[PDB]
């Protein structure tokens, strides 16, 4: 994964 991608549930 990319660090700055959506870190939350249900992206």
């Amino acid at each position, epitope marked *: 994964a990319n660090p*700055n991608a959506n870190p*939350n549930a249900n992206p």
Partner: antibody
Amino acid sequence: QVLLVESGGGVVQPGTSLRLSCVASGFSFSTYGMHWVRQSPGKGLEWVAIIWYDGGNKFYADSVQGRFTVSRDNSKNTLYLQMNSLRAEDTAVYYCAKAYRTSLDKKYGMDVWGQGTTVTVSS
Amino acid sequence: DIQMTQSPSTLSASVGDRVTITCRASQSIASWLAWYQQKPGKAPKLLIYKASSLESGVPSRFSGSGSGTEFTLTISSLHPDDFATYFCQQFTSYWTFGQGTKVEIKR
């Protein structure tokens, strides 16, 4: 009423281990990524770590990678920062922060921070 | 992994003045820029997100502009509540901050 309360800071001797805690209220903690950011008088604001909503993906700043560890207990609404091999440069106020809301955006920052916990590494 | 620098590092201004803080990225960050306000002994508070979007409850006298490598934070008319330190943060390549701009009262 999104709220984050840090705890566990204090005075420790160099080379020891300290675990910081961050407690969340006012939002579904299990559903959000979480951050640790620290601030010294002489290093400004410095990002430390991020952990995915489910505790899987974890990323670290190079200044702490290998020594610090981020984790979380979603059943306790608590974020953790485990600090090992502390050195004088790790003296700072440590803030926990909540990831920004899910949207169509590809890049994500933070929106709400806690009040901070002070770590002092001292001989 | 992108260096943000702010200018000036200290700004002295009067109540009612229009003030402008600039932030420069070492490389293009598109519009992935955030503006924070921090008062002494307090946590940073998010004012502007993705370059220009005012957060809920932040007064409209605050506005952010820019894209790429050059960004600006403007206060149309300074209130005593606005005297604080302001940080810019890029959030496209990890998360890095400028060194801060302390807006102090002129006398």
